[PDB]
Amino acid sequence: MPKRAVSPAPSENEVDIAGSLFAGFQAMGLDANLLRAIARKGFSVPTPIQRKTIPLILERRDVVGMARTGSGKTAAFVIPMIERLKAHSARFGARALVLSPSRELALQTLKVVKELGKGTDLKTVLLVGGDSLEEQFGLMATNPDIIIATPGRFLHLKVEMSLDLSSIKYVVFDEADRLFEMGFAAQLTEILHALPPSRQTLLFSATLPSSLVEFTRAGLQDPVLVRLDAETKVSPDLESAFFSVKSGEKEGALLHILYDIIKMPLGDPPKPTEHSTIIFTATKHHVEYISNLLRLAGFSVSYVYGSLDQTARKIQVDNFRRGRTNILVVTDVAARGIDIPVLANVINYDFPPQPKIFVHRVGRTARAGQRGWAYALVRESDLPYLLDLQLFLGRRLVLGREEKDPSFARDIVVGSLKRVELENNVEWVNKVLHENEDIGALKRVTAKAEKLYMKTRNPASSQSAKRAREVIVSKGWGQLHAIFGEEAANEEQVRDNLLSKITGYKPQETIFEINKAAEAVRSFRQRIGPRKSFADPEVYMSYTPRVKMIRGESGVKIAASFKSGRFEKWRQQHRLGRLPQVGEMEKANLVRNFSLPSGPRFKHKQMKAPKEADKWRDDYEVRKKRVAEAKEKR
Amino acid sequence: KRGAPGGKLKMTLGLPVGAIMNCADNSGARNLYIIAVKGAGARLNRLPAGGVGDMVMATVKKGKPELRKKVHPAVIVRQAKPWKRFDGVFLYFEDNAGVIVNPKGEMKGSAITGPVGKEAAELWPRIASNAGVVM
Amino acid sequence: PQNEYIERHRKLHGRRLDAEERARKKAAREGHKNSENAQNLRGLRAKLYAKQRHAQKIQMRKAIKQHEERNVKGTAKALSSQIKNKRAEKAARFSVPIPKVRGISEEEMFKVVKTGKKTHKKGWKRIVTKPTFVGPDFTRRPVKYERFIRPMGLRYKKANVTHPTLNVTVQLPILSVKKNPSNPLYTQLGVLTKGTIIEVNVSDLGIVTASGKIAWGRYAQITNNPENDGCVNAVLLV
Amino acid sequence: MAVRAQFENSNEVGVFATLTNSYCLVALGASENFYSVFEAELQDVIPICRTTIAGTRIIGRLTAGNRKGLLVPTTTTDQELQHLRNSLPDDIRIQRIEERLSALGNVIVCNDHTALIHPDLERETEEIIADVLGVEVFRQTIADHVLVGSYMALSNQGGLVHPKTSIQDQDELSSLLGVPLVAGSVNRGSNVIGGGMVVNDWLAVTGLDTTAPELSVIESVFRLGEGAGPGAINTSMKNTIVESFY
Amino acid sequence: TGWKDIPPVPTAQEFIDIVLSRTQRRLPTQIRPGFKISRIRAFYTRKVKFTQETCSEKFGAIISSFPVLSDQHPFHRDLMNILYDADHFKVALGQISTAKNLIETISRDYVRLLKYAQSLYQCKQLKRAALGRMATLIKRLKDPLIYLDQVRQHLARLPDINPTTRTLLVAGFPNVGKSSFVRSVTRADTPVEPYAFTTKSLFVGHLDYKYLRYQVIDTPGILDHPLEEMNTIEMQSVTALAHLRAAVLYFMDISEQCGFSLKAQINLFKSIKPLFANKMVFIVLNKMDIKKFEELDPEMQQEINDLTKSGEVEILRASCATQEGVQEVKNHVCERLLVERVSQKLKAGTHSNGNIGTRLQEVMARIHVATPMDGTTRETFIPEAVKNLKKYDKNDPNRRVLARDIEEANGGAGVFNVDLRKDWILENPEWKYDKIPEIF
RNA sequence: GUCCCUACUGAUGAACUCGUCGCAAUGGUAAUUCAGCUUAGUACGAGAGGAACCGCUGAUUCAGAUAAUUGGUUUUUG
RNA sequence: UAGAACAAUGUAGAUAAGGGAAGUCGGCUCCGUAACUUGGUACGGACAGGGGAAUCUGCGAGAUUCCCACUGUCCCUAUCUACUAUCUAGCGAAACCACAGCCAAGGGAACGGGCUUGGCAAAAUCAGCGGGGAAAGAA
RNA sequence: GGAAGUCGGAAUCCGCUAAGGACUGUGUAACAACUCACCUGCCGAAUGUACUAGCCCUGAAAAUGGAUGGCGCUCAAGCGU
Numbered sequence A: 001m002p003k004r005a006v007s008p009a010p011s012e013n014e015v016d017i018a019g020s021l022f023a024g025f026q027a028m029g030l031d032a033n034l035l036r037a038i039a040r041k042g043f044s045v046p047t048p049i050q051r052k053t054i055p056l057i058l059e060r061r062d063v064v065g066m067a068r069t070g071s072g073k074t075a076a077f078v079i080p081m082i083e084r085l086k087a088h089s090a091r092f093g094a095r096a097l098v099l100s101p102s103r104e105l106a107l108q109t110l111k112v113v114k115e116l117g118k119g120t121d122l123k124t125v126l127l128v129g130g131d132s133l134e135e136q137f138g139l140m141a142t143n144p145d146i147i148i149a150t151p152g153r154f155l156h157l158k159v160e161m162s163l164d165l166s167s168i169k170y171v172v173f174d175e176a177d178r179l180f181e182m183g184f185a186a187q188l189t190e191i192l193h194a195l196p197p198s199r200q201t202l203l204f205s206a207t208l209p210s211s212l213v214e215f216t217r218a219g220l221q222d223p224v225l226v227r228l229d230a231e232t233k234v235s236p237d238l239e240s241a242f243f244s245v246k247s248g249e250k251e252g253a254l255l256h257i258l259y260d261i262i263k264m265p266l267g268d269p270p271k272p273t274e275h276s277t278i279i280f281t282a283t284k285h286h287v288e289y290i291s292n293l294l295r296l297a298g299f300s301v302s303y304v305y306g307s308l309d310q311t312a313r314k315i316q317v318d319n320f321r322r323g324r325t326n327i328l329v330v331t332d333v334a335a336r337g338i339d340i341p342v343l344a345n346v347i348n349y350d351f352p353p354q355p356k357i358f359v360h361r362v363g364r365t366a367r368a369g370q371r372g373w374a375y376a377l378v379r380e381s382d383l384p385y386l387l388d389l390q391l392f393l394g395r396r397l398v399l400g401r402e403e404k405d406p407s408f409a410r411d412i413v414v415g416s417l418k419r420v421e422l423e424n425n426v427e428w429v430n431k432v433l434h435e436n437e438d439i440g441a442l443k444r445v446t447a448k449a450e451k452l453y454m455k456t457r458n459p460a461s462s463q464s465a466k467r468a469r470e471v472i473v474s475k476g477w478g479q480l481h482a483i484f485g486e487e488a489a490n491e492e493q494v495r496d497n498l499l500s501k502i503t504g505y506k507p508q509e510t511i512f513e514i515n516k517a518a519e520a521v522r523s524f525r526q527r528i529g530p531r532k533s534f535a536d537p538e539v540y541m542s543y544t545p546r547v548k549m550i551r552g553e554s555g556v557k558i559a560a561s562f563k564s565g566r567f568e569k570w571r572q573q574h575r576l577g578r579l580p581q582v583g584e585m586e587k588a589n590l591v592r593n594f595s596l597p598s599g600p601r602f603k604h605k606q607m608k609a610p611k612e613a614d615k616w617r618d619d620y621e622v623r624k625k626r627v628a629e630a631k632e633k634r
Numbered sequence B: 001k002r003g004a005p006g007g008k009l010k011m012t013l014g015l016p017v018g019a020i021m022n023c024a025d026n027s028g029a030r031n032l033y034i035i036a037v038k039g040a041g042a043r044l045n046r047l048p049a050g051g052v053g054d055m056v057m058a059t060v061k062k063g064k065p066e067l068r069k070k071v072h073p074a075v076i077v078r079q080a081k082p083w084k085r086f087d088g089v090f091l092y093f094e095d096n097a098g099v100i101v102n103p104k105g106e107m108k109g110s111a112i113t114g115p116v117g118k119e120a121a122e123l124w125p126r127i128a129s130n131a132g133v134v135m
Numbered sequence C: 001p002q003n004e005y006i007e008r009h010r011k012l013h014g015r016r017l018d019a020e021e022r023a024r025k026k027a028a029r030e031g032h033k034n035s036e037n038a039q040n041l042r043g044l045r046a047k048l049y050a051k052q053r054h055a056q057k058i059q060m061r062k063a064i065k066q067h068e069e070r071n072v073k074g075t076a077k078a079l080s081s082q083i084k085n086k087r088a089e090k091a092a093r094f095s096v097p098i099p100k101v102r103g104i105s106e107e108e109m110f111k112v113v114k115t116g117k118k119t120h121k122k123g124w125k126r127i128v129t130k131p132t133f134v135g136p137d138f139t140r141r142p143v144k145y146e147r148f149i150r151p152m153g154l155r156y157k158k159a160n161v162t163h164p165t166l167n168v169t170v171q172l173p174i175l176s177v178k179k180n181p182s183n184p185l186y187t188q189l190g191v192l193t194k195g196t197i198i199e200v201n202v203s204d205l206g207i208v209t210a211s212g213k214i215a216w217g218r219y220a221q222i223t224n225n226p227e228n229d230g231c232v233n234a235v236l237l238v
Numbered sequence D: 001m002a003v004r005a006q007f008e009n010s011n012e013v014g015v016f017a018t019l020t021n022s023y024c025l026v027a028l029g030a031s032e033n034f035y036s037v038f039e040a041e042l043q044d045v046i047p048i049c050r051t052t053i054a055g056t057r058i059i060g061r062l063t064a065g066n067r068k069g070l071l072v073p074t075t076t077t078d079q080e081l082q083h084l085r086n087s088l089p090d091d092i093r094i095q096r097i098e099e100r101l102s103a104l105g106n107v108i109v110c111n112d113h114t115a116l117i118h119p120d121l122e123r124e125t126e127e128i129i130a131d132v133l134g135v136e137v138f139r140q141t142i143a144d145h146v147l148v149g150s151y152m153a154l155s156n157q158g159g160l161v162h163p164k165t166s167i168q169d170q171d172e173l174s175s176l177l178g179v180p181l182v183a184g185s186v187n188r189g190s191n192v193i194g195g196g197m198v199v200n201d202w203l204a205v206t207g208l209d210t211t212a213p214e215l216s217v218i219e220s221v222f223r224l225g226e227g228a229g230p231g232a233i234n235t236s237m238k239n240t241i242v243e244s245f246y
Numbered sequence E: 001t002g003w004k005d006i007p008p009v010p011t012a013q014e015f016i017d018i019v020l021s022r023t024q025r026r027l028p029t030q031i032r033p034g035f036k037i038s039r040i041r042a043f044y045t046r047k048v049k050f051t052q053e054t055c056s057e058k059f060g061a062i063i064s065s066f067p068v069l070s071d072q073h074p075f076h077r078d079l080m081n082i083l084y085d086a087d088h089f090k091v092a093l094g095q096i097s098t099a100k101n102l103i104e105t106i107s108r109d110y111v112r113l114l115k116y117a118q119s120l121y122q123c124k125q126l127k128r129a130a131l132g133r134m135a136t137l138i139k140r141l142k143d144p145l146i147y148l149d150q151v152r153q154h155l156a157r158l159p160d161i162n163p164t165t166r167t168l169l170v171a172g173f174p175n176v177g178k179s180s181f182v183r184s185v186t187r188a189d190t191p192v193e194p195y196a197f198t199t200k201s202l203f204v205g206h207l208d209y210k211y212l213r214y215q216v217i218d219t220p221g222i223l224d225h226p227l228e229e230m231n232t233i234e235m236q237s238v239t240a241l242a243h244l245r246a247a248v249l250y251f252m253d254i255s256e257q258c259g260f261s262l263k264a265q266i267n268l269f270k271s272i273k274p275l276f277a278n279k280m281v282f283i284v285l286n287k288m289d290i291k292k293f294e295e296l297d298p299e300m301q302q303e304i305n306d307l308t309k310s311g312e313v314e315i316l317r318a319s320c321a322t323q324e325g326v327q328e329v330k331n332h333v334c335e336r337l338l339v340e341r342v343s344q345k346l347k348a349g350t351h352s353n354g355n356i357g358t359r360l361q362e363v364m365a366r367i368h369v370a371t372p373m374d375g376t377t378r379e380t381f382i383p384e385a386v387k388n389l390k391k392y393d394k395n396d397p398n399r400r401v402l403a404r405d406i407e408e409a410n411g412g413a414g415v416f417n418v419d420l421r422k423d424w425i426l427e428n429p430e431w432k433y434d435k436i437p438e439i440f
Numbered sequence F: 001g002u003c004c005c006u007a008c009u010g011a012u013g014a015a016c017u018c019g020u021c022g023c024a025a026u027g028g029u030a031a032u033u034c035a036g037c038u039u040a041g042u043a044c045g046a047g048a049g050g051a052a053c054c055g056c057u058g059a060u061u062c063a064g065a066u067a068a069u070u071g072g073u074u075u076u077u078g
Numbered sequence G: 001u002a003g004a005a006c007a008a009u010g011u012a013g014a015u016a017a018g019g020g021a022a023g024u025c026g027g028c029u030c031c032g033u034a035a036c037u038u039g040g041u042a043c044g045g046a047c048a049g050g051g052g053a054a055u056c057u058g059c060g061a062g063a064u065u066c067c068c069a070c071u072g073u074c075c076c077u078a079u080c081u082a083c084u085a086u087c088u089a090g091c092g093a094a095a096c097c098a099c100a101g102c103c104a105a106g107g108g109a110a111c112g113g114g115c116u117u118g119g120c121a122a123a124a125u126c127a128g129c130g131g132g133g134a135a136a137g138a139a
Numbered sequence H: 001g002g003a004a005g006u007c008g009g010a011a012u013c014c015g016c017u018a019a020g021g022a023c024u025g026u027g028u029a030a031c032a033a034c035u036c037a038c039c040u041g042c043c044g045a046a047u048g049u050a051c052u053a054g055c056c057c058u059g060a061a062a063a064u065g066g067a068u069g070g071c072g073c074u075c076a077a078g079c080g081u
């Protein structure tokens, strides 16, 4: 049943830099306590995102930050938060609020904020699913200053207390790209409607989907969207090759890359490795298929796909960063989620629809002046997207071996592969598919996924399609890759002449002509036989540019505003009094009644009395005494 | 080919759709979750169920994280719901347990923890090979 | 097997021992079977069979007459092809990016006007159901006609125009509606009915005038009912 | 002499059969094709008995024994024991044992000289096997697989072990058993050698899906079909093996 | 595996009849003028849409069933290009795709028209208009459907050629003895007729040697012409020769019985060698019965020897009529293919880094034999009846009675009742068939 | 801004002396699908693969019974 | 108002008492001591635990196995509330009522209950009741 | 490549004539072979092509069981005078 039960978990990662249409620490001037906390943490120099963002946040401007995971966005918005709050407030009502996608991300934010505010009297609360709604009631009674929450639970508690958020002045959206991918849009909009207009809005993300751009335009007051510069210029130290590959030879071509074009050692390796190969794919089914195929071939491979378990992703990523696995296969969304260290080797299995997505996946490497390699497998159907990539990068295309020494780093050089081994590899793939049934089932699943992904993938441009047809007609599509060698160029050419002049044959008559059908074919042939600078550069205006609905926790459809009253019943349960209205001093007796446990939070909390002792049972008196102890504890 | 066993006699089915199960092999999963039964007949609101030796489709709920949240065929080897064998013997097991098996009938693991049902051992020759206790 | 194995098996072992007799009997029984079919089977299948046998006998009679004659004895496609190749080459080469965005349509304009005006007078809207031609993508109509709504699904922009003397039909753009001889209001709004005079672009035909000149627009009478037939057919008045 | 057969349509011969140097046990079911193949290969040279164990057809995986004796699990009933005793000559001692691990054919592999057992059998069972079979019983796991009865086939002329046994494990096992061992596959890649084959000093019966290269390997290892079959054939004509099982 | 599973392609009239009958018989066909205008619109738009998705499903099946020429192996691509004119193939497929698109657009426009219709007459006319316009489209796509049907039939009959496997390309001049060897070596029914271009396609047969499976591809026949003025069937052969990693067996005909000259045969082989650049070339003197090699002119002998003195092109001898040496040439070529492929596989396993591959070490583990160090063997208790035994043979008249024969004589499979006490060896033979007391 | 009549269907019933054993006008009507063994790795097929008739054994649903056995329910207040 | 039969029901609404199911983002640092500038640095110790059910060896460092999450979600079980009732002795209404009351076709006025011509059709009752004997007015 | 009337394009004649097409189909890889067209011998007397006019079948049908009023009617108890 649950094969494609809902949808391919990694859908797409759409990015819009047209969203650009929005518009030391001591030298930055932080408080002494915050400075000592940062010194304890070890943030000697702020990361580039911090350096560009924190001054703006201190200048009280709403900002959207394009930054990779692990760039330090968490501290980037927590340090200004602590600097702004700087003390616990005796007036009831919180003013710091952050919305995070998942509980793990929320806990990471909790750890960051605690370590960055050790000593300061700020009260920070976590509000995520799986915890007791009563416990969250008690924490709101403790009256925190900072709220770190997941939006669904946030609305649940919002509806349950009818809380007043007018005191909130500081609002942060962490990983809003994940928020919108998981589908938090409507409830986020209702949160925004609840929030007072007089607030400072921070939004940290790695990508800017058009939905997120519209949300920012709707909810942000003059956003000074930010970004870096490694998110534009493909590091010139990146050297790229493109391989014309066939559908049935795709896996064989991927291993020739690994074997003869990369010299990838087999077995467990004896901080990434010297090789450091990442593989970017189209869906999780390709992820599993390629991972298992590589593992059978003998390659130390870790796989990370979209809807993978948290612990599993953690283990695989930790192995890749420690160098226990040298190949890492990711789709797009898992890649964006995981913090990828410096890489030397990038392989694009399925071509990306967006040249900007290609730019991200290749800026994954060739960093800090260290040279990087990018090999991309392209098919005839993906050739228009390759040409769109050409237009985006403004580089020249070299097809096959039109130039003797093409510069693969600055030129987009496309070629085929060593026919000899390519075939010895494709035969191996066919053999393993015929032998291992699990691999065959996986291959069929990825075939269906390929069909679905081709159906749902965004289209190319008309000019790209036309010139793709022209390239396919041209000779440059079918010869070797410049890398191989001029001697190969010699030997390939020794017979390529006759081979090509055989491939380019126009039959005089079909085997059917060799009846009414024969007459129809002859008429068909007769019908469809072949058909018989000067400008001023200074001023030449050119053409190209230079009851509302929300989903509940149970998943069953639930109305937007449904006050179950169980908060009032909570009040009745624990005989409490009226909650402190916004502004009134925190009530220490209620704080002591419901403040917090003694530290570590266990989960295993059932105290059940044992069954009544039986005389015929062996441990009669012992069971009787434990039952007596249980009734004494009550 | 649908994994419906042939020659299976009537016995009481006590493991309906959506049923939590122990995992008896060394494959890396601890529990399974029956969602569908092979060879079942859709009646009005009738929940399909399977007895010892019947192939089902199960999803792992706990175990090795790499295999977690994955769906595999399985065949059940131990059933706590009592049923009668043709020698007139009504019997039941301590828990509910099965083993992950490919659609042809081969096990992913290499050993079975605990006894194996006689019906499953007779229907699937591989389980008879990977079984140490047969009752 | 790998090749023409049925003829291979035929050449090695032959046919069934009564295939030829079976075929001859079936061919002889064809006449009785045809009469039985014509007199018995009933309901849309008779209608289909009858309409078929009519076509077959007409074809057979024409073939017999042609054979008798020959035994006794001892352009519009070209013009249309020229037009289509001219258009195809123009489109293929001389295409460069240029702004072209259509204004929002009369339906959502009316919806916005309704949002601006609470009290809806009964029957304040009446959608024009007959097919129309508008021209410009966006236009603000006068108050006099600001209450006729012409749907996009009914709007047309091209018509199949037939030239009699140069006997050929060409799909040509519609320039303007000159007279609809059923209602002056329909003429003003662009309602497209039968026998309707429209102005059609005759650029691709290449009509030479008395001054030797090339025609770029002529009158055409629409001669069908576009409301019933989802297309516009007109005959040039030349 | 290596032959191919199926019980009903299943390639697993060792599940439904048990072959030794003095008797043959065949699962009883429907037709007589399996019994006929076995008798046409053993034309009354040794007794062949249509038997059921614990009311099952898995007699091959439920029975363990050699030319000198036969052992059955405690679940086997007195009528089945009477059938076995009446069909088998007096030169063969039959005994029923109360092993916790009832799958004797899966936990014990025994030739006429040595037996390899699951390391978790009882002491009483270990020396009762040593008594009934009159062999040397060793506890060991092959290829980290604890079911030696299903993962190894043994004879007095050779032994076929799990395809993924290491060289150290293989030569250690060869040292203890005293016969050559080769890691090979049966029934087109299946790893259950014991469950897919019964073999004795002059006969092997495998499944119909067993490929020609691995059948030749089987014949060479067990020295079958007269010829030579020392295993030196396997060493010499390595081209077939490297091409087929690459 | 093959292309026999491509669904049949109907003609234009059959397609129209299928689609317009499905829409007639799978939907209700009675609406009344006294019903609501909304329900009339719904009825007619349902009819139009249903016809649309029916046509779209059939066209999509046609587009997706036929193999894509791009993603095929080069041999198959060139073979289909020669046999079917990939240009016309793509043209017809594009016509099908464009017709699908236009049918979809027609359906959309007429659905809008039906939305804005106000009479049952108008909805009827608009429905008949839509279905009628689409039928015009199919009638226009009459001829491509016929071409697609013919190509589908030939593709379903086409042999399965495995591009990357142990293969013997059997080639030569016409009437040399190609089919005569292929039938002698394999079970392929390839006509051996004494006329010229008897074989009009590639035939494939299968062989077993040293427990390995071999493919043998009989080619039609090549004449002495440049590769540009070259006929279709024999370019099918040259494509087979050009895109198959193989051992090419070129047949030579010493006699002039073939109909061609020795010098012409040498010229043709020299012309085709560039395609046999690295493929293993074995020229075997076919028809060595009539004119043996010894009875041959010395300068021609020396030309053949000079042909030997080039690369690893070697010449053998066989008569495919006297069953003389076809066996020997078979074993020679098959063994040398085996040794070449094992050499290549071991080289591929041994990488420049020096690390032995997983597959290579698995092969080593499977090929190693373990022997006890003590060097002592174990006794074998084999009875003498085994050596004094007689093979059972089903064709023998006086066989053993056998259980299959007795059960077939005494009933069937679920009818014969077996007596389990027949083999009971007891003290007294009459004590069998005795009922055992069990409970007292 | 508006408890009765009849239909269905059991269960009774006066008149023919009561009772026993029967006939059968008319009305209703019931079985359904799949799998396994043998045929048979046979016909067919280059290969890959791959049936059917006779015979035999089961299972799904539907229908009509039943309480040996095995579970469940206790106002038996045992 | 009292006797007989079996008499513990069902529905609905509330109620934190429990269970089955569905969804998931569910299962798996601190104290003391020593130097340094009030806060950090190293060393030592503890933490990152219980409850219930069980199994195996001779209470035993006893060893081994299984279960503990929330949800504005559904259902079920549990408590409370209200209405829930066959016959017999006595007493004893009301609504409603032109007359009636078996079907099918036809009876131009989207009209049939009485007419045509057809199916048919046998007293008097009891219980169950799910059909009919109620409906428009039209821009 | 092969194409002999019959995979294809164009012309499509003459002789013998009783008559025979540079061929109407089957068939061969091509032949070959059969067959049709046309002609002769036997038979022996009316045929056979296209239309028209009656009656009849078909020319479309759903959904409770029913209707030339019903039974029923066939050289009528139907149709025409």
Ligand SMILES: Nc1nc2c(ncn2[C@@H]2O[C@H](COP(=O)(O)OP(=O)(O)OP(=O)(O)O)[C@@H](O)[C@H]2O)c(=O)[nH]1
Pocket: E172, E173, E174, E175, E176, E177, E178, E179, E180, E181, E191, E192, E193, E194, E195, E196, E197, E198, E199, E220, E221, E286, E287, E288, E289, E290, E318, E319, E320, E321, E322
């Ligand atoms: N005497 C003799 N005749 C042979 C020999 N090989 C083939 N022939 C004859 O050659 C004729 C047919 O040869 P094929 O095998 O069909 O020739 P081919 O090279 O396959 O070419 P195709 O004719 O196109 O199939 C028959 O008459 C055979 O008897 C041979 O070795 N000796």
